[PDB]
């Protein structure tokens, strides 16, 4: 094994003796060299554990670090300031000041120039964090909504150019907003140069994917593979026109990159460095669990997958310290947290909390949510959750069967009910959702639909607006970076005309992917409209959250309310939150509140609340009570 000093002197060899002396004395090299010393041992250890005595490891690493230096050398000085800032403030992600949003550039604002025009609106809403959906080249028609990448460098012409993208990031940065983009590193589209060249038998792209001669290995692999999109194909493999079979976890036009090849890592680390230099603050690590395969296993959450993401982490610690990771691990809760670490993904989506928010609206019972908040919320130091109500994807019921069993709940049966309820196939259901990927061999099913459609706003349920307010309050107050699915703040309903479009007809997720609703955004300042009610509520909660330090950090302690319909938790021993999930008034008794101060200010309603008597919460009422 080499070391940091060794590789530094080999990196410098591209300069003639005269230049070398000037480079070694410079600021950029000093910082790069210092960071090499601090972080290279982690990088070496992580890559060694995956590749071992692979002949390609040394020369790949020298090539990678040579590019890391070039990349950091070129790096704009504005970004180097954020590098130093975040290097000295690892907990920036954990501040109550952070409130995030997500949107498609096309659907929300037409193009990138239009998105830039929407930046004053984001400031009005209070956003410090904006996730922009896949921006780069993708095949015509079906492309998993941008997640089948055909070019990591060529921006979608319908969205604009790379120059427009740079202007956006710069304008966002001026407005105090972090730019967040997808790092689609598990797979490319079948029309990507790498894909074509690999399949053509170009030796330069040998083993960039997993291509098999026949069904022998596919059949063996399929024994233990989960099916993500059963509607498209069975198992995890698709057949090429020449009869060969390729690894396709998702759609058949999405080919799994082969990380068992150390050159695929270098390739993707090179793409990561490019995104860093555009000024991306947070990379959303798409489909993290799938990047390592092994016969006999589910090819999910494998030790080598975690190792590799930690290798990517070290590359950023060396060449772009500002760049943080957002893990997309939509899996078992035990496996979800294993991606969250300072040396892996600093943050990650919190599907457990999200799925239970919706569960609790359906059952009216807080049990699973309480359990999850009690035992699975707190994280290691310098890490945070991304708490959300809805997203661009379907909802999966990813609670732990083991957890639910402790509460005498059958996981399988409960998911049957949830799916039936949220697609309006249970008596008296307020939800108006659409089935997604019903699998008849596994009984599994997911749910599409917007937040507003799932709470009952489409049929004007009198309780609808209060349900949205309740859900977002919890995402905003539990601890973690809250993410708003833009459009939710005005109660945007489904695109009910999704399925008659043949490019979308087999993908029900398009139902909750509607265009900018001009009518609802026009109503946002009108307190008589649902759009206005929702908007003022969320804006108020965003304001409170950002200005009140009782929300700071990601730690919480649950408070047993002794009412099965009411959630309770405490932040920083100073903010006590209650959330009523029943559509009827519900009471927290004087007996339960004995330890609390006699009176407390409620940041939601603005009133003083007397806690030395019974406390009756209105249907779906939320309280944020300052107790210290």
From Swiss-Prot:
It comes from the Bacteria. Its main location: secreted. Like the recombinant protein expressed in E.coli, the amylosucrase may be secreted in N.polysaccharea without cleavage of a signal sequence. The record marks 444 as: Transition state stabilizer. It is found in: Secreted. This is Amylosucrase. InterPro entries: Amylosucrase, Amylosucrase_C, Glyco_hydro_13_cat_dom, Glyco_hydro_b, Glycoside_hydrolase_SF, O16G_dom_2. Monomer. GO terms for molecular function: amylosucrase activity. Substrate binds at residues 144, 187, 254, 284, 392-393, 509. It comes from Neisseria polysaccharea. The active site is at 286 (nucleophile), 328 (proton donor). The keyword Glycosyltransferase applies.
